[PDB]
Design a protein around this ligand. Sequence first.
Ligand SMILES: CCCCCCCCCCCCCCCCCC(=O)OC[C@H](COP(=O)(O)OCCN)OC(=O)CCCCCCCCCCCCCCCCC
Lengths: 67, 318
Amino acid sequence: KQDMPPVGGYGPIDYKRNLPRRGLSGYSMFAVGIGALLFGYWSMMKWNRERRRLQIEDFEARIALMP
Amino acid sequence: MFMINILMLIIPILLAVAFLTLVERKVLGYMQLRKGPNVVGPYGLLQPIADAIKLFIKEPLRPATSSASMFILAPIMALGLALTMWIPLPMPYPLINMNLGVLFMLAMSSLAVYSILWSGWASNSKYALIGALRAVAQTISYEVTLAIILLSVLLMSGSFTLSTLITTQEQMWLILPAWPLAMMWFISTLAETNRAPFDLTEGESELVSGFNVEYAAGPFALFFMAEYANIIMMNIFTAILFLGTSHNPHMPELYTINFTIKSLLLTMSFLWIRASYPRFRYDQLMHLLWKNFLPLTLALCMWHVSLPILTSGIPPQT
Ligand SMILES: CCCCCCCCCCCCCCCCCC(=O)OC[C@H](COP(=O)(O)OCCN)OC(=O)CCCCCCCCCCCCCCCCC
């Protein structure tokens, strides 16, 4: 007279389906995104506009001498 | 001693391509929930000395039906253009200084696929015959995706050499500004060098084993050591062409230290994929390039052309 089923009580644990979590949806992206790309170029247009300022300085010595 | 600076390169790298094969299955081990080669090491770090020695003891058959003259000159390559391409590659000081050398990669990126067409044809019938033909066909259609999106940025830096390409990425990690492109610089080298998600060239699923099928232990170490001499180079390139380090005219050494702690992260990407995604069924494989990848790559080229001109930006070079 030792058999399995307990006196009362159990779960259940479900069978259901969920994990749809986001995550900056629905045009929130395309908003930050195009915002970074610009600050990329603004970081250019200055380094590259400074480096030319040195470029001329370098061709200067060449023309300075060479008589 | 210029000859001892070379041979100090070819030798110390054949250890990486060797000991990658170990970190192949440790990292890809714990994705699976298990440990990696363990029993032999003690840590495993001793595995690859035992594996290099089983092949060359193990007898190297040739097919009775082969043309032996091609069955050599072909693999006698898969180990050149893999070890030549390394030459002009700054870290920080490249062994060669090539004026326009960036273009020189595409020269040696283009000339390897003409060592696939030999071998698979050199031997014999339809598993390596038409099976080495149609991995030609995908390997050349992922250049036009390439040379353009390599040529884009070079409008944004001024020249073809690599000593300028450390200067321009100074305080700007060149991945901000073109981040749309950078993606496609990644899916290319992963599609071109025959790696995980577009896997077809080397067979597992679509066929038995692509292009390796005939070589017994004897030659097949070379390819299995050639195919991993491309993969750690394009990925030791991408990070000179995107994620830049900061040269230091004083402690050169701290340049490379922080440089291998990037290029060695980056690589561990083609392993971090391969656990994950399935394959493409060769139609979808090219059919997604012309239609999809390409139209942009042209369109952006019409963009990075004007953006300097339209900002008085034009980078300081010839
Ligand atoms: C299978 C076994 C039998 C085969 C064994 C031999 C195989 C050889 C295969 C050759 C493969 C590599 C050849 C690729 C040539 C690339 C040369 C090159 O691009 O060098 C770049 C450099 C450019 O010069 P630059 O930097 O602009 O100016 C410097 C100013 N100080 O250029 C220079 O600096 C000047 C060039 C100096 C080099 C002299 C010319 C070398 C090229 C000759 C290759 C001969 C072709 C051999 C067969 C090729 C088959 C693929």
